Amino acid sequence: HQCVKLNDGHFMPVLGFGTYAPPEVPRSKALEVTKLAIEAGFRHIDSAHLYNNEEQVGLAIRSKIADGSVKREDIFYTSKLWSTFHRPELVRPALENSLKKAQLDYVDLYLIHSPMSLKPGEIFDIVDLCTTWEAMEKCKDAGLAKSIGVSNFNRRQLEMILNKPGLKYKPVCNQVECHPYFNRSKLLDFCKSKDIVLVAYSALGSQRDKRWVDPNSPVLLEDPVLCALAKKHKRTPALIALRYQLQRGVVVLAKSYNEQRIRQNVQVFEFQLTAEDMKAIDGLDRNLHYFNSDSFASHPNYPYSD
């Protein structure tokens, strides 16, 4: 295992467990798989208000602390502020609600989930995200979140926060879709220049949910270059996709609700890719965001406009 030092001095483990499962998966499965993830060695656990699982994920964490397997300070838990709660007066209550659902005193990381503000209390809203970010800074000062960051921001959106007059805490990270078909090189370079960690979701090619993903889109884990690399290293396409991210300096999430795959994914630390391997993977980039829906693409702050 290892950690990256965030720009506020806290540490984030480089491999994260993805906890989202679509609604057909019974809620209690999150409890079970989160416990297995922790048994396999995951210490970074990624959730959100949106994922409707914070109560099960928090209960997994508390159970593994309660039985001596881990201490609270060995777990890095992320939640996220949903886009109906961008108005500043809504931010701390949203974080408090997440904390109550998970039964934790603090989150290691709290993210603005998306720049795409939605109308509260119920379609887009226009919110000054610099005001949302001030509200986020307040949550760090209160000890509700050790660190704060963003998700789904593009470069212009991130700059807007970084250039805020009176900025107190830079975002520690930008959690974004990132994988060999959509590798975000230029955004990564920008993030690296500002000491903001890029965190990759859908690093294994997404769950291909029919609500948002084109089933015609290429299946990342069937890619022939990943398959060739998997054979060369005697690993699996998933492990090649994860290892790629680690060697680019990207913190990588990995969702699995399968016991065997959960245990396999921690092997990312057991091997290395060469410069030539990495070049071959870099050759797959093709501007493919799996999340590609009419329900998002017209939003005035849709990030894939730039």
Ligand SMILES: NC(=O)c1ccc[n+]([C@@H]2O[C@H](COP(=O)([O-])OP(=O)(O)OC[C@H]3O[C@@H](n4cnc5c(N)ncnc54)[C@H](OP(=O)(O)O)[C@@H]3O)[C@@H](O)[C@H]2O)c1
């Ligand atoms: N910030 C945001 O807007 C945002 C958006 C999307 C996701 N996320 C976060 O990112 C996490 C991960 O992304 P994601 O949900 O798109 O899924 P992902 O990590 O890309 O995984 C996709 C599929 O890979 C399969 N898989 C996992 N390990 C494998 C292995 N070793 N070999 C073969 N298949 C494997 C899993 O199926 P099985 O369960 O059957 O193993 C999984 O459904 C989410 O759970 C959530 O925590 C955040």
Ligand SMILES: C[C@@H]1CCCCN1S(=O)(=O)c1ccc(N2C=CCC2=O)cc1
């Ligand atoms: C998918 C859209 C368009 C691309 C940027 C991000 N978003 S979003 O912020 O509207 C968003 C983020 C996450 C989700 N989501 C829904 C269930 C799992 C999941 O991550 C849905 C929409």
